[PDB]
């Protein structure tokens, strides 16, 4: 039986490999060995204790996505305090808003990114690191916390922001399931190097690093010196990383612009928005295993998973988000206002709003019982997302299918649009895709591959030429609403254009 | 030739009918005759002058939607100052945000709805009224302003708010067109009573009252004592009013709940969201003329209009928003990034993003040249809305047509859904409607008329019964996503269900 708190599971790794490096930035500064982490947690928690910060107290962790932030989280955990995750880049008014919601007892400021008015009334502690033996006095003193005790808070927006309270179990519930069931969808390897572009104030970022820390991994976060992702993954020789479809799309573009490969890369976790099947297939060709994750902050990150397997690329293109881990219960509410907690009807539908009952679910929105009671009922979380459980057992976030692009009410054949587009001089290859529209059904989006290498002006010139061509040759509604110059066009082995991969990339 | 500023046009009415009442609340307090308005404008402008408020200066008008607010606007106009419209109900952080954007020289506070930090550094003037001859010293002293000089600012949001700078011409450009062209789409009658539920910080509210003030009308605003609209319109015997589809829908419900009528009501102006053809037809049966208006804050309120006429209800149901006033130029950009200001292509399409060139258009977003240059180019405003100019000359904000409700990819017949629903015991009448969805094409929305009069519990009980019925009798995707108990179901004279009126009301 593993320890029941995040901090204890981390310290257990610190006992096995105390000299192993735990946290460091991309360049290498703010580096912490596991023994240095334990020592610094104790010191910072001692500094917090001098500011009336006790068990249950809330601490505003002004994040920098670096080692100092996750140190600050674990320092709060030592007191049994709650680490309120606040983005350092955000304007003062946002952070001032955060303080009013959470009413923190103190603030932990990690460098780096003129302070809010609320911080003038509360204690503020600066947290930074510089460049022995495993101290047993810092290993002792862990507050008697449990899996149900709150650890951190993550903010989520439609307009107004809410504070998602997360217990310790959120960060190990699913990993323990994968271990117990002997599943390989997402795996950790002790000592291996990982990187997170996702901020610590992001549910995906905070969750990922903590899971890696509890598995004794080398976690590289914060201190980005380059906009290049290919560089960081190869410079630091990472094995695993957590991405959003936009960032994975960026990486693939870099892996194409240069005949490149990240050999050290073993596993890629991706999610947050519409998956791009083209980018996933490309990186699986490299030999890297991937796993799509579906979830919310309210569900403690991942709840459904889509790991690398036969036919995976096919269903990801069809809009599959995956299927739940064993122990995570799912329910499709066909009618609004009638969930699984409603008496009578009924069994889960094959289509409807997704309700999730997971051991990683939130405790509830902080200081907001009214809204919490609309989303969290009897352990079930209303995701508010429409899903479809198809006849294969997978859940799809979009529906099938548009064979023609029906704009307004007129059926528009993609082959015709492609033909007209390809009839233009400067174009080598062209493919259109469907852009959904509530008012007009669908829109015509057009991806274009230029024969030559165009600058900013030549590309714009080609764009206006293609549009003027459609104005004359085609008719409404068969006129492209958007025309974009793309490096390449993803196709199946049958030669069929993967238009969903184009659409997903168009939004991202 | 009429005066070129709003203030001068108002004062001209104050010369014709100085004893006529200009502004008052719903109950009757804060009442101002036109001569009392002129006197109070001068005094308040004198009070502003003592706080370094000169021509071009910006004044934060903390609105209350009452007479004191519009007094404050006209007082700013006297100095040639800009009245920054700020909602009093909004939280401190919002108003603090407003001050940072506009950098005001002073603030005019009208009672009623703990002040922002920014107001501690700027002068603050309280403005309230209580209970002779037309003073010629207050009639004189109007700063030499023109139609192009800025008068007020209106804030608009996706997430972040922008300050829309509006010149004087915004408030009389279109009215002057209607007068010159001899059109009757929207008319004013001197002395008549008008009411505005829309706030002064709303573009529709501020615009409406100012137009009525310049036409010498009795303007009732602010100081709402009841939630009943039927009462206010009948108590104060108004002739005209400005509404949003939600409020018009509310009024109709009240006009049904009691066998009632607003006889004094002559004209109803409505717009802002999807028009409900059922509610419009109902109030036109009363004998009241209506006019739909399409526009943005960036276009100085209304730009297109749909007045009461033969076949109007038919096209409003089809999603028509109207057609431009003579002088207002429209352009449908078929492809994103290619507007009317783009060289080459082309003539206006019959489908695309609407660009509007109007004499009522904004001057630009305050202190934001970058975003202004993306929306306001050579006098054209990018509405960002997809419109379709059908073969009748009207512009439609939605497309035709869903004959079947295609959820996922399955064609679903409304007659079948209606039948299953009506087969339930407690239901007298039932009709479904299409709810557009980007991911699944469409959803099934269901409107239900109960045979008896149900309380809150009996209605919920009926709802769950109907849903459980569809779970068993029907199949996905033909299961209703939403089930609502409605008072009645709008039909044509042919008996056909006006399902768009149901959908529009469902969103509102
Ligand atoms: C290895 C694991 C870490 C690597 C991945 C880290 C990213 C995963 C963290 C996700 C949680 C998060 O971002 O917070 P939020 O509450 O905003 O998300 C919820 C909203 O987002 C959308 N959505 C999430 N999943 C999605 C997915 N699969 N397909 C498509 N839409 C997805 C949904 O529409 C939902 O409304
Ligand atoms: C007698 C005249 C006064 C009585 C009416 C007063 C209300 C009219 C004032 C409207 C201006 C306003 O509300 O500001 P905003 O910039 O938010 O509006 C712009 C947005 O709103 C939507 N939209 C406006 N018009 C609409 C209409 N006709 N159909 C459907 N959608 C309409 C559009 O989608 C647009 O994106
Ligand atoms: Mg997300
Ligand atoms: Mg609006």
**DSSP of A286-344:** TT-EEEEEEEETTTTEEEEEEES-TTHHHHHHTTEEEEEPTT-EEEEESSTT--TTSSS
Cβ atoms < 10 Å from Cβ of A310: 6
Q: How far is CA A279 from CA A208, A238, A436, B20, B227, in A?
A: 21, 19, 22, 71, 55
| Pocket (CB within 6 angstroms of ligand 2) | B 156, 203-204, 208, 242, 244, 269-275, 292-297, 301-302, 321, 385, 397
DSSP structural state of residue A188: -
Give B169-224 as a DSSP string.
GGGTHHHHHHHHTT--SS---TT-EEEE-S-TTSHHHHHHHHHHHTTT-EEEES--
Assign A85 to helix, strand or coil. Answer: strand
Residue B477: its chain A contacts at CB < 8 A? 351, 399
CB under 8 Å to A91, separation ≥6 — which residues? Answer: none
Closest CA to B279 of B235, B240, B313: B313
User: Token pair 């946290």 is at which residue?
Assistant: A23
Strand, helix or coil at A427?
Answer: strand
Compute how many other C-beta atoms are within 10 angstroms of the C-beta atom of residue A121: 8
| B-chain residues near A411 (CB < 8 A) | none
**Cβ A270 under 6 angstroms from ligand 1:** yes
β partners of residue B282: none
B449 vs B434: CA distance, rounded Å: 18
Q: Quick check: B346 and A471 CB within 8 A?
A: yes
Nearest ligand to the C-alpha of residue A198?
A: 1
Residue A354 parent element (H or E) = strand A351-357
- Distance to chain A for B438, nearest Cα, Å: 5
Bridge partners, residue A406, by sequence: A411
Nearest CA to ligand 2 atom 2: B269
Evaluate whether B382 touches B339 at the Cβ level (below 8 Å). yes
Directed axis angle between helix B203-213 and helix B6-16, to 10°? 40
What burial class does residue A259 get, using C-beta atoms within 10 Å of its C-beta: 0-12 exposed, 13-18 middle, 19+ buried?
exposed
* Pairing between β-strand B58-63 and β-strand B106-109 as defined by DSSP bridges: parallel
Is residue A122 within a helix (H) or strand (E), and if so which, with residue range? none
Q: Please answer whether residues A155 and A162 qualify as being in contact, where contact means their C-beta atoms are separated by less than 8 angstroms.
A: yes
CA of A124 relative to ligand 2 center, distance in Å: 47
Vertex B98 angle, CA B92 and B99, to 5°: 95
Q: To one decimal place, what's the resolution in Å?
A: 2.8
**Token pair belonging to B338:** 């290619």
Locus of tokens 């703010």: A30
**Ligand 1 binding pocket includes A301 (Cβ within 6 Å):** yes
Token pair 């107290």 is found at A57
**CB atoms closer than 10 angstroms to residue A15:** 14
SS3 of B238-288: CCEEEECHHHHHHHHHHHHHCCCCCCCCCEEEECCCCCCHHHHHHHHHCCC
Answer yes or no: are the C-beta atoms of A439 and B399 closer than 8 Å.
yes
User: Can you tell me the distance from the alpha carbon of B299 to that of B379, in angstroms, rounded to the nearest whole number?
Assistant: 10
Pick from B441, B446, B461 the residue to mutate for testing the A interface (most A CBs within 10 Å): B441
Tokens 């709840």 appear where? A303
B350 touches chain A (CB under 8 A): yes
Q: Using an 8 Å Cβ cutoff, are A58 and A123 in contact?
A: no
CA of B184 to the centre of ligand 3 (A): 50
User: Do the Cβ atoms of A409 and B400 come within 8 Å?
Assistant: yes
Regarding beta strands A380-389 and A351-357, do their DSSP bridges make them parallel or antiparallel, or are they unpaired?
antiparallel
B-chain CB neighbours of A407 within 8 Å are: 351, 399
Long-range contacts from A368-375, C-beta under 8 angstroms, 24+ separation: A368/A162, A368/A163, A371/A162, A375/A298
| Gap between the terminal Cα atoms of chain A | 42
**Cβ pairs bridging A and B (under 8 Å):** 145
Experimental technique for the deposited model: X-ray
Residue A418 CB contacts under 8 Å (≥ 6 apart), including other chains: A430, A431, A432, A497
The nearest CA of chain A is from the CA of B396 a distance in Å of: 10
Q: DSSP H helical segments within B19-150, as ranges?
A: 34-49, 67-79, 92-102, 136-139
Selecting from B319, B346, B476 the residue whose C-beta is nearest the C-beta of A351 gives: B476
DSSP string, B399-430: -S--SSEEETTEEE-HHHHHHHHHTSTTEEEE
Please choose, from the candidates A284, A287, A208, A191, the residue with its C-alpha nearest in 3D space to the C-alpha of residue A244: A208
Arch. (CATH architecture) of A1-401 = 3-Layer(aba) Sandwich (3.40)
Q: Would strands A427-437 and B58-63 be described as parallel, antiparallel, or unpaired? A: unpaired
Q: How far is CA A34 from CA A139, A193, A208, B294, in A?
A: 11, 14, 17, 63
Give, as one character, the DSSP assignment of residue B491: B
The DSSP annotation for A237-274 comes to: T-SEEEE-HHHHHHHHHHHHHTT---SS--EEEE-SS-
The encoded tokens of residue B91 equal 């939280």
Q: Pick from A97, A159, A351: which is nearest to B93 by CB?
A: A97
- For residues A337 and B467, what is the distance between their CA atoms, to the nearest angstrom? 10
E runs forming strands in A27-101: 32-33, 58-63, 82-87
**Cα distance between the two ends of chain B:** 42
Up-side HSE of residue A90: CA atoms within 13 Å toward CB? Answer: 18
Q: Report the SS3 class of residue A28.
A: coil
Residues of B in contact with A439 (CB under 8 A): 319, 386, 397-399, 436
Q: What is the token pair recorded at A45? A: 């928690």
For chain A, give every domain's residue range.
Answer: 1-401, 402-508
Q: Sign of the CA dihedral B65, B70, B72, B73? A: positive
Q: List CB contacts (< 8 A) between A437 and chain B.
A: 386, 438
Say if residue A422 is exposed, middle or buried (CB neighbours under 10 Å; 0-12, 13-18, 19+). middle
Contact A26, A62 (CB under 8 A): no
Gap between the Cα atoms of A35 and A483, Å rounded: 55
Give the residues across from A396 on adjacent strands: A320, A388
User: Half-sphere exposure (CA, 13 Å, Cβ side) for A342?
Assistant: 23
Q: Residue B507 C-alpha to ligand 2 middle, in angstroms?
A: 15
CB contact, 8 Å: A464 with chain B?
yes
> Smallest CA–CA separation between B130 and chain A, in Å?
38
CB contact under 8 A, A441 and B437: no
Query: May I ask the CATH architecture of the domain A402-508?
Result: 2-Layer Sandwich (3.30)
What is the distance between the alpha carbons of residues B215 and B20, in angstroms, rounded to a whole number? 12
β-strands A218-221, A150-156 pairing:
unpaired
**Residue A131 to residue B157: CA distance in whole angstroms:** 47
Residue A119 carries which DSSP code? G
SS3 of residue A138 by DSSP: helix
> What residues 465-504 of chain A have any CB closer than 8 A to a CB of chain B?
467-468, 470-471, 476-477, 479-483
From chain B, the residues in CB contact with A408 under 8 A are 351, 388, 399-400
All residues at 6 or more sequence positions from A118 whose CB lies less than 8 Å from its CB, including other chains: A95, A96, A99, A100
Selection from B425, B428, B461 nearest residue B447 by Cα: B428
For ligand 1, say whether the CB of A85 is within 6 Å of any of its atoms: no
- Find the radius of gyration of the CA atoms of chain A: 25
How far is the alpha carbon of B343 from chain A, nearest alpha carbon, in Å?
9
B28: tokens are 């009757």
Partner-chain contact A399 B386, CB within 8 Å = no
Query: Mutating which of B438, B442, B463, B482 best tests the A interface, going by the most A Cβ atoms within 10 A?
Result: B438
Length of chain A, please? 508
Nearest CA to ligand 1 atom 1: A269
Residue A50 contacts B, CB cutoff 8 Å: no
> Which residue in chain A has the smallest CA separation from B345?
A468
B354: left (phi over 0), alpha (psi -120 to 50) or beta: beta
Tell if the CB–CB gap between B479 and A335 is shorter than 8 Å: yes
Asked if B370 is an interface residue toward chain A (Cβ–Cβ < 8 A), one would say: no
CB A502 within 8 A of CB A480: no
């Amino acid at each position: 039986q593993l320890p029941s708190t995040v901090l204890d599971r981390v310290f257990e790794q610190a006992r096995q490999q105390p000299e192993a490096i735990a946290l460091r930035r991309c360049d290498g500064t703010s580096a912490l060995r596991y023994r240095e982490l334990v020592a610094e947690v104790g010191g910072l928690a001692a500094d917090l204790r001098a500011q009336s910060v006790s068990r249950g107290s809330r601490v505003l962790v002004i994040s920098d996505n670096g080692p100092e932030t996750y140190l600050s989280v674990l320092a709060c955990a030592k007191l049994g305090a709650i680490a309120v995750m606040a983005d350092g880049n955000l304007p003062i008014a946002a952070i001032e808003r955060f303080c009013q919601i959470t009413d923190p007892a103190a603030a932990l400021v990690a460098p780096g990114s003129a302070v809010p008015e609320a911080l003038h009334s509360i204690p503020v502690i600066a947290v930074d690191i510089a460049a022995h033996s495993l101290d047993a006095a810092s290993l002792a003193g862990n507050a008697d916390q449990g899996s149900e005790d709150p650890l951190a808070m993550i903010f989520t927006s439609t307009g107004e922001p809410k504070a998602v309270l997360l217990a310790n179990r959120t960060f190990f519930a699913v990993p323990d399931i994968l271990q117990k069931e002997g599943l390989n969808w997402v795996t950790w390897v002790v000592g291996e190097t990982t990187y997170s572009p996702l901020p610590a104030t992001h549910i995906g970022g905070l969750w990922w690093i903590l899971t890696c820390l509890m598995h004794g991994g080398l976690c590289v976060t914060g201190g980005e010196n380059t906009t290049s992702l290919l560089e960081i993954l190869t410079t630091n020789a990472v094995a695993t990383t957590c991405l959003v479809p936009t960032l994975l799309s960026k990486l693939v573009s870099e892996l194409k612009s240069a005949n490149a490969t990240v050999p050290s890369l073993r596993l890629v976790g991706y999610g947050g928005s519409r998956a791009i099947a083209a980018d996933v297939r490309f990186i699986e060709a490299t030999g890297v295993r991937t796993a799509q994750v579906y979830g919310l902050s309210e569900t403690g990150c991942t709840a459904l998973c889509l790991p690398t397997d036969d036919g995976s690329i096919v269903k990801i293109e069809a809009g599959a988000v995956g299927r739940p881990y064993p122990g995570v219960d799912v329910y499709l509410a066909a009618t609004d206002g009638i969930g699984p907690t409603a008496p009578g009807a009924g069994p889960s539908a094959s289509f409807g709003t997704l309700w999730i009952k997971s051991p990683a679910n939130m405790l509830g929105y902080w200081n907001n019982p009214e809204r919490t009671a609309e989303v969290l009922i009897d352990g079930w979380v209303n995701t508010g997302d429409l899903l479809e459980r198809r006849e294969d057992g997978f859940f799809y976030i979009k529906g099938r299918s548009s064979e023609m692009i029906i704009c307004g009410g007129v059926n528009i054949a993609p082959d015709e649009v492609d033909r007209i587009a390809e009839g233009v001089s400067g174009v080598r290859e062209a493919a259109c895709y469907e852009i959904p529209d509530e008012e007009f059904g669908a829109l015509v989006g057009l991806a274009v591959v230029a024969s030559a290498e165009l600058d900013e002006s030549a590309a714009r010139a080609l764009k206006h030429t293609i549009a003027a061509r459609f104005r004359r040759e085609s008719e409404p509604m068969a006129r492209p609403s958007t025309i974009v110059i793309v490096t390449d066009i993803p196709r199946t082995q049958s030669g069929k254009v993967m238009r969903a991969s184009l659409a997903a990339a168009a939004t991202a």
